[PDB]
Design a protein around this ligand. Structure first.
Ligand SMILES: [Mg+2]
Ligand SMILES: [Mg+2]
Lengths: 83, 83
């Protein structure tokens, strides 16, 4: 088993800009073969042995975003300062 | 006496972008001769008879801002819109 990863339950929601339904992050991370335990608002994710690419929370964010479909991510313009 | 004017207690703070000390708006408006009464977070300002120019909250904002001095207003570039 690779080392466990600690990540907030709403981290994929923040990076995607989408409010995913309840339990979406835990369910998708369990589908790809990882074991997820709940510690309040923080998830402890241990990726499966066949997924050594999952080392940081960003690696887990890509798993949720790609399985939920990148088409659900809205289109908002960033707040760029005066150049 | 001209009709009374209602505006928020922090309206001059918002228009100026400066967090004035508490009681600044009420002190300055009474200083120019207006009757100021308190109702929660809304000020009822009755300008004096020699100030018919004070008719709207914007007129009251000018009095607080000019007496406190426009030098305290910081230089904050607004975010660049997607032009
Ligand atoms: Mg990846
Ligand atoms: Mg004026």
């Amino acid at each position: 088993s690779p080392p466990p990863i600690r990540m907030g339950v709403d981290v994929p929601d923040r990076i995607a800009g989408v409010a995913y339904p309840q339990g979406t992050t835990a369910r998708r991370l369990a589908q790809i073969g990882a074991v997820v335990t709940h510690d309040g608002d923080t998830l402890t994710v241990t990726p499966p042995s066949w997924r050594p690419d999952l080392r940081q929370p960003a690696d887990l964010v890509e798993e949720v975003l790609r399985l939920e479909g990148l088409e659900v991510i809205p289109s908002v313009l960033p707040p760029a300062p005066a150049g």
